[PDB]
Symmetry: C2
Subunit: 256 residues, 2 copies
């Protein structure tokens, strides 16, 4: 027996490289005053949660806190230009505010297509044909703070970031879709990241990853705020989504 | 309790309605080119979705007012006895709009008719939109159109399926039909009644993105790759097992 080159409806990405790969986490808790954006209490919990879960799946996790845009671009360009020949895949997470096709760094916004474009085709040959997974927790910062230099509560932010696709073998994962609202607990973290991390821990090492993101869709879209705390948040449902350009099934079975 | 393998309940009396809006030519004032090959797509889709148990209704070259009337009529009948709902658009598009014969319609208007508060009997059921629409260029020939329609999400339990993503190109053969629709239909025919539907759409991503654009008959088209995508808001696994 051998596998002839016939179309296989069950084909999986090859995940038997020496290393799982790098997972970058860009964590943004506060912003330059000229941006008029509120701080994001709870994001440090998200960052730590994600680090534990992706480390357990075999990723080399690198976190960066509150980088300026020039610094962020430098760092992500450095990762896009090294060889990933010995890696299975690549993960990039943004924890911030966003608007349209932009995510905010500390001092300025950056276009999502600029960040994903660094990993397309022969800009990053050693990731061609490998999953490139971007996870974005970014929505509209509520701006009732001034344009001047300056307990567990749930903050509710309108969806603002477009659910953009990218190239072949990219998977773009969004905390919330247009017309819905993103939620973050100031001590426990974001609804989306909490539920993503819980599902990674329970099922990440077995379930196909888009099947796992569908579980996250279900968990998040079924959450509600306590009515006695913030009646304002009634009817502000959160529905995540993911935009898949993947071409094979993706698993994170423990590496041998 | 939470079941990591939970499936949509697909044991209703009927599979449900599949609507297909098929646009081959446009009012002259829109200055959009004809879409030869689209009738093949329509026929292919009708067969595949019929075989999966759907009640397929096709509409050719409706005006926007006619199209809105029809999709509104469908959104207000009871789907209580149905598993799910499918809507296919075969046209040109731009941004958040798809073209009818005489005018643009916003995708969010069309999907909004099937949100929970407007269509109670589809609550918690899959609502699947499949969009073959890109930028009209203003024997079997292959036409190549730049991506133009945003890969928009919708509400819970919607699945939005696009023939092409930003930066890539959609292809249509004047005899054989659209690349995306051909490969979607081949996969439906072979695996539609067994495979989880997003796993099937992933196969379609692979098939379409592997179609070679190295040596076209039209030198203009060289290197203009096609990559589809789908945006899922589903909350459970979706299968179309024979009823
Ligand atoms: O580029 C866009 N992409 C998307 N998606 C991709 C979603 C939505 C959108 C909306 C207004 C203006 C631009 C865009």
């Amino acid at each position: 027996f051998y596998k002839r080159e016939m179309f296989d409806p069950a084909e999986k990405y090859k995940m038997d490289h020496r290393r799982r790969g790098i997972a970058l986490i860009f964590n943004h808790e506060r912003f330059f005053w000229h941006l008029t954006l509120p701080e994001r209490r709870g994001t440090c919990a998200d960052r730590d949660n994600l680090t534990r879960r992706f480390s357990d799946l075999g990723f080399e996790v690198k976190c960066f806190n509150d980088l300026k845009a020039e610094e962020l671009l430098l760092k992500i360009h450095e990762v896009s230009t090294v060889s990933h020949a010995d890696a299975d895949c690549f993960v990039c997470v943004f924890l911030s505010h966003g608007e349209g096709n932009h995510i905010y760094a500390y001092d300025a916004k950056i276009e999502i297509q600029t960040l994903t474009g660094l990993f397309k085709g022969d800009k990053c040959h050693s990731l061609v044909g490998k999953p490139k997974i971007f996870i974005i927790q970014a929505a509209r910062g509520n701006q009732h703070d001034v344009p001047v230099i300056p307990t567990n509560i749930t903050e509710v932010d309108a969806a603002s970031v477009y659910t953009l696709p990218a190239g072949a073998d990219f998977l773009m994962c969004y905390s919330v879709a247009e017309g819905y609202y993103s939620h973050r607990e100031t001590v426990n973290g974001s609804w989306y990241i909490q539920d993503l991390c819980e599902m990674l821990g329970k099922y990440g090492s077995s379930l196909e990853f888009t099947e796992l993101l569908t579980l996250v869709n279900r968990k998040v879209s079924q959450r509600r705020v306590d009515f006695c705390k913030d009646p304002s948040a009634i009817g502000k449902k959160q529905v995540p989504c993911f935009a898949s350009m993947l071409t094979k099934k993706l698993h994170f079975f423990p590496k041998s």
